[PDB]
Design a protein around this motif. Structure first.
Motif, short mmCIF file in Angstrom:
data_model
loop_
_atom_site.label_atom_id
_atom_site.label_comp_id
_atom_site.label_asym_id
_atom_site.label_seq_id
_atom_site.Cartn_x
_atom_site.Cartn_y
_atom_site.Cartn_z
N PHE A 59 0.87 -1.15 -0.08
CA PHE A 59 -0.18 0.01 0.02
C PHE A 59 0.81 1.18 0.09
CE2 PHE A 59 -3.29 -2.78 2.52
CZ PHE A 59 -3.73 -3.38 1.37
N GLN A 60 0.38 2.27 -0.81
CA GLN A 60 1.19 3.61 -0.79
C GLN A 60 0.11 4.55 0.11
OE1 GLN A 60 1.44 4.66 -4.90
NE2 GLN A 60 3.37 3.28 -5.23
N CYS A 61 0.96 5.35 0.46
CA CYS A 61 0.26 6.47 1.30
C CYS A 61 0.93 7.81 1.31
CB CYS A 61 0.33 6.03 2.83
SG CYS A 61 1.80 6.00 3.48
N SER A 62 0.22 9.02 1.58
CA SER A 62 0.84 10.29 1.84
C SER A 62 1.06 10.57 3.27
CB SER A 62 -0.04 11.18 0.70
OG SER A 62 -0.24 11.10 -0.53
N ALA A 63 1.79 11.73 3.50
CA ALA A 63 2.20 12.14 5.14
C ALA A 63 2.41 13.53 4.82
CB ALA A 63 3.27 11.33 5.43
N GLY A 64 2.06 14.28 6.11
CA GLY A 64 2.53 15.58 6.33
C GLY A 64 3.31 15.52 7.81
N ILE A 65 4.26 16.22 7.85
CA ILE A 65 5.27 16.29 8.68
C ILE A 65 5.28 17.66 9.26
CG2 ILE A 65 7.45 15.84 9.82
CD1 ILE A 65 6.58 14.37 6.63
N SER A 66 4.75 18.11 10.82
CA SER A 66 4.86 19.61 11.12
C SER A 66 5.04 19.16 12.62
CB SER A 66 3.61 20.33 10.49
OG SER A 66 4.03 21.50 10.95
N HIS A 67 4.48 20.29 13.15
CA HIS A 67 4.62 20.48 14.74
C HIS A 67 3.33 20.30 15.37
CE1 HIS A 67 8.69 21.86 14.84
NE2 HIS A 67 8.55 22.73 13.95
N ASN A 68 2.41 19.91 14.53
CA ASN A 68 1.10 19.65 15.44
C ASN A 68 0.07 18.77 14.27
OD1 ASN A 68 -0.80 21.67 13.97
ND2 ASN A 68 0.77 23.20 15.24
N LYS A 69 -1.07 18.35 14.97
CA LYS A 69 -1.92 17.54 14.26
C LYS A 69 -2.53 18.34 13.16
CE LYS A 69 -4.31 14.57 16.62
NZ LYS A 69 -5.34 13.97 17.91
N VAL A 70 -2.84 19.67 13.08
CA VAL A 70 -3.76 20.48 12.24
C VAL A 70 -2.74 20.66 11.22
CG1 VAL A 70 -4.65 22.57 11.60
CG2 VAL A 70 -5.49 21.21 13.59
N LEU A 71 -1.54 21.15 11.21
CA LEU A 71 -0.44 21.47 10.34
C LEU A 71 -0.20 19.98 9.57
CD1 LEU A 71 1.72 24.11 11.85
CD2 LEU A 71 -0.17 24.57 10.11
N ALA A 72 0.16 19.04 10.13
CA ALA A 72 0.21 17.86 9.65
C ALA A 72 -0.80 17.21 8.82
CB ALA A 72 0.86 16.72 10.80
N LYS A 73 -2.05 17.43 9.07
CA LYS A 73 -2.94 17.00 8.02
C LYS A 73 -3.13 17.83 6.97
CE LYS A 73 -6.50 15.01 6.40
NZ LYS A 73 -7.85 15.09 7.07
N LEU A 74 -2.88 19.17 7.11
CA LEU A 74 -2.86 20.12 5.96
C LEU A 74 -1.82 20.13 5.15
CD1 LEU A 74 -4.37 22.75 5.00
CD2 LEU A 74 -2.63 24.00 6.37
N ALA A 75 -0.58 19.53 5.51
CA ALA A 75 0.61 19.34 4.87
C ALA A 75 0.43 17.95 3.96
CB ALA A 75 1.91 19.28 5.71
N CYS A 76 -0.14 17.21 4.66
CA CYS A 76 -0.28 15.57 3.91
C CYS A 76 -1.13 15.96 2.66
CB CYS A 76 -1.23 14.69 4.73
SG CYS A 76 -1.26 13.00 4.10
N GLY A 77 -2.08 16.63 2.73
CA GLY A 77 -2.72 16.80 1.26
C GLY A 77 -2.11 17.75 0.22
#
Ligand SMILES: O=c1[nH]cnc2c1ncn2[C@@H]1O[C@H](COP(=O)(O)OP(=O)(O)OP(=O)(O)O)[C@@H](O)[C@H]1O
Ligand SMILES: [Ca+2]
Length: 426
Positions: free
Chosen positions: A204-222
């Motif tokens: 399976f392939q996936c995307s990911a966001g890496i940041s300093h909190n959940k909201v920025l990480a979710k935004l980054a993932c997209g």
DNA sequence: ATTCTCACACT
DNA sequence: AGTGTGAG
């Protein structure tokens, strides 16, 4: 406080149900395809869409017959049905495959059947000390985008990704084990490794966001999907938010986000920085106002919960239109079908996860009412026995029957819902 | 008439 | 306990 204390990622499986079906049936790989439920009405409702089909305009919520108008060569896989209702077991089991792999790298919070937040702060600290002080090579980041780069004084996508990554790594202060940008970069290295492991061990392939909190990480993932990851640094937030519609930030996609836009007369997340914290609290409440004040500066404190298993297990079915239930014995029969699938999943949960639910929540929807649910009632869940739950569920809803007849149900039911809650260790 | 889960704030 | 919001 600059909200840079933690390293948090969000991993999202790309078009997850499609990937599970494509792994199983190789004829579907690299094709426009979708996963459907309930084949009889307008060809089935689409619940997942491959990226090749999204390029034709196919989306979720569409009927398969309509999707075939946009994409005539669309291939379809249909969800298993059990006792009259879509059965998601295959996908919950694949979800477990991936979460067990993620758990080797860090403690995770299951966010949905196909996303998980990852708290990488401690993993990063251990990779930093093992890393002496030598430089992070771009070879350790082969699918990472640095949001906001390249900038300053190539026409193809991979060229741009590399130029942005080179500028980031060139300017990185590797001698300072406490720079938040360095911690994010090590975090991104770990997430590359975690995503390689997921793909190697599940396909399976996936995307990911890496940041300093959940909201920025979710935004980054997209920002760079599918099969890529994106690092959103604290410094990248002013430019990123300057044109970011408010509704894109997690929890602002609904009525609160529309109120923020309307009451303040703004469109973008960055525009919130001009209001005091008291001003925002006066419009939106103490909690929402403080949260918005920090979040528009890139700061959010919601912890990654060490929780890989759901807190409730629920079983619902909708009965829209002329299919709304109208007889007592109809209502009993469907309550029994829901209670039977519930018993199956609960017994698996008591064998896999060493706990027992103790409360049974029953909810119904009534034809003509407006809302997701019309009514919620509860009772004890003392035995994992479908006939007893379904009997008990009827008992606590049988007086909602406004009809004077004993054998007719007025007004007709457009939804039944059974949910097991209040788990205790077993 | 897409549907179906699950989490949490408020009262 | 029951209702309402927000999300995947
Ligand atoms: O709007 C919805 N109504 C009901 N259920 C939904 C909805 N939206 C999502 N779900 C569920 O949540 C799974 C993955 O939700 P998702 O948003 O991550 O969608 P995908 O992975 O397919 O594509 P991505 O865009 O992520 O690449 C979906 O299959 C489905 O189980
Ligand atoms: Ca996904």
């Amino acid at each position: 406080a600059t909200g840079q204390d933690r390293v948090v990622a969000l991993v999202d499986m790309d078009c997850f149900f499609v990937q599970v079906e494509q792994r199983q049936n190789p004829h579907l790989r690299n094709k426009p395809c979708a996963v459907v439920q309930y084949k009889s009405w307008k060809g089935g409702g689409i619940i997942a869409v491959s990226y090749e089909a999204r390029a034709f305009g196919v989306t979720r919520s569409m009927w398969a017959d309509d999707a075939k108008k946009l994409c005539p060569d669309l291939l379809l896989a249909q969800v298993r049905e059990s006792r009259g209702k879509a059965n998601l077991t295959k996908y919950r089991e694949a979800s477990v495959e991936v979460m067990e792999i993620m758990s080797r790298f860090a403690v995770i919070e299951r966010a949905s059947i196909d996303e998980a937040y990852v708290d990488l702060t401690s993993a990063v600290q251990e990779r930093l000390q093992k890393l002496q002080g030598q430089p992070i090579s771009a070879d350790l980041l082969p699918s990472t985008y640095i949001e906001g780069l390249p900038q300053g004084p190539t026409v193809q996508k991979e060229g741009m990704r590399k130029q942005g990554l080179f500028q980031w790594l060139d300017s990185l202060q590797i001698d300072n084990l406490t720079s938040p940008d360095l911690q994010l970069t090590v975090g991104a290295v770990i997430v590359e490794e975690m995503r390689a492991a997921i793909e190697r061990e599940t396909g399976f392939q996936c995307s990911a966001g890496i940041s300093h909190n959940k909201v920025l990480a979710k935004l980054a993932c997209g920002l760079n999907k599918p099969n890529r990851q994106t690092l959103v640094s604290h410094g990248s937030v002013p430019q990123l938010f300057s044109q970011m519609p408010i509704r894109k930030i997690r929890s602002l996609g609904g009525k609160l986000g529309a109120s923020v836009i309307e009451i303040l007369g703004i469109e973008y997340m960055g525009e919130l920085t001009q209001f005091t914290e008291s001003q925002l609290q006066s419009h939106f409440g103490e909690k929402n106002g403080s949260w918005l004040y920090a979040m528009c500066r890139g700061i959010e404190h919601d912890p990654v919960k060490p929780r890989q298993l759901p807190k409730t297990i629920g079983c619902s079915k909708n009965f829209p239109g002329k299919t709304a239930l109208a007889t007592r014995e109809q209502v009993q029969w469907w309550l029994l079908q829901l209670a039977q699938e519930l018993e199956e999943r609960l017994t698996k949960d008591r064998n896999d996860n060493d706990r027992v639910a103790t409360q049974l929540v029953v909810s119904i929807r009534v034809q003509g009412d407006k809302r997701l649910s019309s009514l919620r009632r509860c009772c004890a869940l003392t035995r994992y026995d479908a006939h007893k739950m379904s009997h008990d569920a009827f008992t606590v809803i049988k007086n909602c029957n406004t009809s004077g007849i004993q054998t007719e149900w007025s007004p007709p039911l457009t939804m039944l819902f059974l949910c097991a809650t209040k788990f205790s260790a077993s």
